[PDB]
Chain A
Amino acid sequence: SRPLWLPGSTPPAHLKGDLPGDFGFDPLGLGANAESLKWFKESELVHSRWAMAAVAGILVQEIVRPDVFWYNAGKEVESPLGPLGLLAVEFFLMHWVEVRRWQDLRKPGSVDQDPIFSQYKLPPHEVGYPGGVFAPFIPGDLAELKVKEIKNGRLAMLAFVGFVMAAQVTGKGPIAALQEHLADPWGTTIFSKAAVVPGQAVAPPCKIPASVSYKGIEIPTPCFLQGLWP
């Protein structure tokens, strides 16, 4: 009745197209339990929204600041607030925001009220889609926009993973890595730099230093699952 991830297949029973972005993909049956699916549905949106901002953020950083590698931006950035001053502010602000989001998930409607100003409240809403002040402008139908959000979100989640593994394998940002592919497309793919055959395994070298010195301490910087690289 609806397009599927694998055309011609039959979606699992627990998937019926109610959710946006429901293309009948759950081969392991992780979402069969209703309670689990509610938590996983919330988690997918959060991962997707974080990934979309991060992928957009990384791309703009490279264009605006091509001289700084996004993978190194943690140590290269110097601000007066210092390391622990920034972390302390981030911890408390994120703890408040995340606990309130969490409470809505457990008990929907219980954190729609503004704690300080008694006249402001979020109108009733679905979990994961807090309207009101968070949605001043809605260009069109929500149902269509929800599909657009999750599809772009699932693409940005894969894009970030592509940035991480490309950075560790090439040591270059997403745009610089792309230009390397375009210069020599036949000699720049992962197949062109790695291969395993019976009796020999060749893997690229991790282009990230094993450790980073930062303000008098050493921060380990290991490549992700390097021993399992092709």
Chain B
Amino acid sequence: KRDAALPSWMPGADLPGYLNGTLPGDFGFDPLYLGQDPVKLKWYAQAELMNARFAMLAVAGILVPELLSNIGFSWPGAGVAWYDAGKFEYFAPASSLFGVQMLLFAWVEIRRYQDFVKPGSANQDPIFTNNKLPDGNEPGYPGGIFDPFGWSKGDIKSLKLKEIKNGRLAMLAFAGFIGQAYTTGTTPLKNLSTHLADPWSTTVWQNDLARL
């Protein structure tokens, strides 16, 4: 039932009709029919954006710090694996940092949720009432102060597709960090160097068979 002009995750396949192509990154992939219900699909679309944008920040926050250390840049946190950052000594105890984090994230997340329930109802600054986001925004794409450079005024449809594509790739990358670190016990870029050193004897088959 899906339009044949739309791109497909499996060329030639007959895909569900409810994925009509409005959402970005709509390739008709839903073999388990999780998004069949329109009410749940609405929630999943936002959840995909949220997990996708945190994954992109997280992946960039795990490679660049490791890349800089390998280059030679020196700073107190250099050379610390992403899975050992918790034990590192910061200016404040980790417990107090977590407490501040939840209070700050309670404010912004409840503001974001208010918009999802009633879009356009959280666009106004509560203190400096003059400030406000433009009235045309949609859930998940605030704009206004969140888009200071005005990129959203261009080809928005292409930009949203680029965002979700990079986001889906970042989500897989973070899942790779968990699996690779758990099985190899080393940082992701060290794993890449091992693979490039001898690609033909460093596959997951080679590595896991040895550990078997």
Contact = CB atoms under 8 A, between A and B. Distances in A.
Find out whether A and B make contact in their complex, taking CB atoms under 8 A apart as touching: yes
Contacts of A87: 205
Contact of B200 (A80, A107, A115): A80
A85 B12 contact: no
Interface residues of B, number: 11
A85 B11 contact: no
A43 interface: no
Interface centre among A88, A111, A113 (most CB of B within 10 A): A88
A82 B200 contact: yes
B22 interface: no
B12 A107 contact: yes
A103 interface: yes
Contact of A85 (B10, B13, B200, B209): B200
A133 interface: no
Nearest to A80: B200
Contact of A82 (B10, B11, B12, B201): B201
A219 B201 CA distance: 20
Contacts of B201: 82, 84-85
A115 B12 CA distance: 12
B11 A110 contact: yes
A2 interface: no
B115 to A, nearest CB: 39
Contact of B199 (A85, A107, A111): A85
A102 to B, nearest CB: 10
A86 B203 CA distance: 11
Contacts of B13: 103
Interface string B8-29: 0011110000000000000000
Interface in B161-212: 199-201, 203, 205-206, 209
A113 B200 contact: no
A65 interface: no
A161 to B, nearest CB: 32
B12 A103 contact: yes
B70 to A, nearest CB: 26
A106 B11 CA distance: 12
Given A84-B206, A84-B209, A88-B205, 10 more contacts: A84-B205, A85-B199, A85-B203, A85-B206, A86-B200, A88-B203, A103-B10, A103-B13, A106-B12, A110-B12
